[PDB]
Amino acid sequence: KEIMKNLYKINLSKYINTEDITKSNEILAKDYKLADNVDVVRSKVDICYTQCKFNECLELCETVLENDEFNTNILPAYIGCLYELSNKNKLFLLSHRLAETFPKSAITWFSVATYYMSLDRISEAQKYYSKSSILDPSFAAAWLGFAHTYALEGEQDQALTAYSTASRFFPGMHLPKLFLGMQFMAMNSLNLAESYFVLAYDICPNDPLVLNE
């Protein structure tokens, strides 16, 4: 139990009680030679992603991906911090390799849609997020990227329903609600935006997007 308690503690959510997750990370790193463990690296990557350490996301996930390039748990965070770094060649390579590796996984189609978003081809990203969403009904990135495609396309009425769907399917996820509130700004409807942003800020006290909004 001395080790498995910590191992289970690693896998909880990262927004709250962040420091204890860190101390558990050094606890595993010491006395157990598990610093090389893949899931320890995954936890550290998610720590870095939470406060938006996207450069550290890139470096750590590149170190882990060299050993294994198809860890499905690792990959979505790497897509996120790659699109944040706004680079198309490496996203492009990984997406085209995953397409021929795992044709039936929504992960690769999500990566393709992200690549098209990075290339600002909204029309194709529409379909390539729709396919990823259809493949995995439990894939929040799919719905939020879908509504991102809607919002960046020019039309927003369907983006409203999309963000509402993403919010309702996944209760307790602040990001769909936050993006829906950004859209409310886009329609100049601030009255719902106040409540939605308060709800999002209830669990995200320190992140640039919330405070900027």
């Binding site: 965070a77 944040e84 978003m117």
Partner: peptide
């Protein structure tokens, strides 16, 4: 996660019109 592009503030035409007008009466003052 696909982070949304943060919204950016724009310089409106009404405020710049107000400022250029105020400058017009400012130079008309003396």
């Amino acid at each position: 996660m696909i982070r949304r592009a943060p919204t950016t503030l724009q310089l409106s035409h009404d405020d710049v019109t107000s400022l250029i007008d105020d400058l017009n009466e400012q130079k008309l003052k003396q």
